[PDB]
Design a protein around this ligand. Sequence first.
Ligand SMILES: Cc1cc(F)cc(C)c1Oc1ccc(C(C)(C)O)cc1-c1cn(C)c(=O)c2cc(-c3cnc(C4CCC4)[nH]3)oc12
Ligand SMILES: Cc1cc(F)cc(C)c1Oc1ccc(C(C)(C)O)cc1-c1cn(C)c(=O)c2cc(-c3cnc(C4CCC4)[nH]3)oc12
Ligand SMILES: Cc1cc(F)cc(C)c1Oc1ccc(C(C)(C)O)cc1-c1cn(C)c(=O)c2cc(-c3cnc(C4CCC4)[nH]3)oc12
Ligand SMILES: Cc1cc(F)cc(C)c1Oc1ccc(C(C)(C)O)cc1-c1cn(C)c(=O)c2cc(-c3cnc(C4CCC4)[nH]3)oc12
Lengths: 111, 110, 110, 110
Amino acid sequence: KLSEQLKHCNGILKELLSKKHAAYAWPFYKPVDASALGLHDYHDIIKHPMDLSTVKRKMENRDYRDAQEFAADVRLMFSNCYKYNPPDHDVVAMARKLQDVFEFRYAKMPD
Amino acid sequence: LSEQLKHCNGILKELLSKKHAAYAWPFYKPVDASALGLHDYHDIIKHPMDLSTVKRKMENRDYRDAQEFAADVRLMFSNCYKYNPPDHDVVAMARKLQDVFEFRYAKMPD
Amino acid sequence: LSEQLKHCNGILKELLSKKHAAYAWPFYKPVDASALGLHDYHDIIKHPMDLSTVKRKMENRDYRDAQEFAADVRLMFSNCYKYNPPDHDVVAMARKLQDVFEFRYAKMPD
Amino acid sequence: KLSEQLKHCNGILKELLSKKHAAYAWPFYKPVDASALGLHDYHDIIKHPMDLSTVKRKMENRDYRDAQEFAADVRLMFSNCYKYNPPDHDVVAMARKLQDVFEFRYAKMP
Ligand SMILES: Cc1cc(F)cc(C)c1Oc1ccc(C(C)(C)O)cc1-c1cn(C)c(=O)c2cc(-c3cnc(C4CCC4)[nH]3)oc12
Ligand SMILES: Cc1cc(F)cc(C)c1Oc1ccc(C(C)(C)O)cc1-c1cn(C)c(=O)c2cc(-c3cnc(C4CCC4)[nH]3)oc12
Ligand SMILES: Cc1cc(F)cc(C)c1Oc1ccc(C(C)(C)O)cc1-c1cn(C)c(=O)c2cc(-c3cnc(C4CCC4)[nH]3)oc12
Ligand SMILES: Cc1cc(F)cc(C)c1Oc1ccc(C(C)(C)O)cc1-c1cn(C)c(=O)c2cc(-c3cnc(C4CCC4)[nH]3)oc12
């Protein structure tokens, strides 16, 4: 019970979670564990946390109304990363590699 | 807020600055499809977008908020990804410039 | 019809041609408030328009009919009359170019 | 019973009918007398005749919804003239002078 756009979004999600991107996808698979890392300010700066398993949860529950909502969550995840972090951190470069995969596949969606 | 649109204007200035010219130049003006020999560009890309258009819209005060500004900038990158195969030089350049944009846009005070 | 929009494209080419360049040049690109130092231009003119914007809209296929094209050209001329006093050179130039546009637009098929 | 905008339009119409502009307004005071002029094809080419007396009556009867509808009638009158005539005819030059008065005053509307 998915539209053809959201079927394509599910394909993108599946692509993002696949083995070939794991080397740069892994920091986004589960929520950032800010307390464990001692990032005391993380939740003061990031008011809407997002991660790939949350997106998956939402997709499996049929919560996305259209492709634009799916895209907004995925971009939120990357934006949180860029917002919180300095430009030289490993995680920013990993975000950028994964976002290239996302944006490119998202732009090839059918009309 | 005008303060949000002011910071979007700073972002736009950054994207147009000389330091990024090596990967930003293809996005300064609309794709000249007939010069390039692209008979199908306007068939495939229904809503073209480029930095000069975003400039004009910013100077005209056409953007209600930062979200509209970002939607045009991302429309520009998406058009590029949509039209092109992944190995084309312009795609590599789009990705370099989008990294500048996304990083700066995420640091916007809100 | 595409034949009416094709005729509109012909008018646009006529307005951009060298023959009219002595009076058309202020309308080629958007009014550059900065270069002119006009802090109130975008306060008074809410919807700027110019010939390159019209051209980009034509290339992008944003015009649904000839009336929409005409509306933009007339908006361009109206902004100029609105902002300026009657004895400024730009108003005389606007009027000469509008005479070309209105005449050619009146000769459209159907 | 007239809005601020239509009140301004009524002011415009008064100006177009005033003695000041009579030397180039007179051919538009009343319909083109095609029998008298010997124009057997005028009503084939011009499907919607329009003159300043028509606009006056519509204004008096409150048949204008808005200023845009008013503008459309006045512009129809000028377009009919440009449509039927070659560019060197005296009536075209008279139409152009009167249209300059109209377009300028219309652009100064509240
Ligand atoms: C801390 C860290 C060191 C590295 F060398 C590489 C990465 C990816 C890295 O990031 C993470 C590692 C593990 C985990 C957990 C514990 C949840 O599995 C999360 C991250 C991590 C994920 N995301 C999305 C982030 O935005 C950030 C940010 C940080 C981070 C940690 N310390 C900082 C410093 C930089 C100034 C604050 N940022 O760590 C992560
Ligand atoms: C065509 C091309 C060859 C290169 F080697 C490098 C670039 C950047 C490049 O792209 C452009 C070069 C010039 C111009 C001008 C200045 C004429 O408007 C535009 C582009 C260009 C900009 N943008 C945003 C694009 O999306 C594309 C896409 C293309 C393009 C041209 N030919 C293709 C092939 C690839 C499949 C069809 N894609 O060219 C551009
Ligand atoms: C300023 C000016 C002096 C001249 F002698 C002739 C022209 C055309 C002229 O107008 C322009 C010159 C350059 C440019 C550039 C290329 C920078 O965008 C624009 C104009 C111009 C174009 N259009 C369409 C306009 O409506 C106006 C209006 C003005 C203008 C500048 N200063 C005024 C004074 C009078 C009201 C305040 N009006 O300038 C332009
Ligand atoms: C025919 C003519 C000769 C001139 F030397 C000057 C004018 C204004 C002029 O136009 C008119 C003169 C009188 C009248 C009367 C009062 C009889 O209704 C009408 C016109 C006239 C008004 N308007 C709005 C027009 O569009 C046209 C068009 C013409 C016209 C007459 N013959 C032509 C042919 C000649 C090649 C085109 N056009 O005449 C008028």
